[PDB]
Symmetry: D2
Subunit: 78 residues, 4 copies
């Protein structure tokens, strides 16, 4: 239910405003935002919405890295 990513936020201004209002859903909530590599944890109301979120993250940052797929990154970062 808590899914973690690693992104390189664009230096383009208003990117986080674009991320909150477009990349994420209304019921989705950011649970982590630690440092331009940024670690971010997002909680999902339903697991059936994860795949579409992954696609939107790839549009925002093609350099995105899903943490939960690599166990070592999960143990080290989370």
């Amino acid at each position: 239910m808590k899914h973690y990513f690693i992104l390189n936020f664009p230096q383009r201004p208003g990117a986080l405003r674009e991320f909150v209002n477009d990349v994420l859903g209304p019921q989705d909530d950011i649970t982590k935002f630690e440092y331009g590599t940024v670690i971010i944890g997002i909680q999902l109301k339903d697991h059936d919405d994860l795949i579409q979120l992954k696609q939107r993250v790839n549009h925002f940052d093609p350099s995105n890295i899903y943490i939960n797929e690599n166990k070592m990154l999960y143990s080290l970062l989370i």
Copy 2:
């Protein structure tokens, strides 16, 4: 000053970052720094905000005060500005 810096004890209310971006922040305003200084995910964060216009600073401070009543404006303390920025 077009870049302003604050100290906030981020509320545990869900969607706080969305609340800060859409309500505490202006549509033409951007955040330039988001760095914790405390540790856990529950922590004290140092935030930097850039305003489109300086006239919106007084009203911005009030929005930050409603978000975290114990917030601290750094730009008006030379000691904290020199140490944290």
Copy 3:
């Protein structure tokens, strides 16, 4: 011009653990170039080391292994080196 070695260690919470790493684990000719945390609840740290004698690297990894058996040599993993350096 120079080569450095970065490690991930679950640094023991015992007091004086850094003196042990500097004196017992690290050779007198070797120096530390990076000490940065990755998480807390203050466990994981990235420690970068510059050795004057590359031939002593094998012995270094042993002393790091005895210090923290959870040692991870960052330089081996491709994804870890690019992400963390």
Copy 4:
């Protein structure tokens, strides 16, 4: 807390020259003084075994970094950073 506080915190500008941490661990610190914190300008915490040893530690810290800031004096700096 005239002689009963054993955890003391400082803000130092570490020289980026080699062996600085070895110089700080051996030359600056005392034999019974143990490090308790080191986070990035770096905030450092040391626990003494004897409060009388504090004077010498502060003197040696001033030599290492004249720009050092003993945090415990400022209750504000103590609250925000610890």
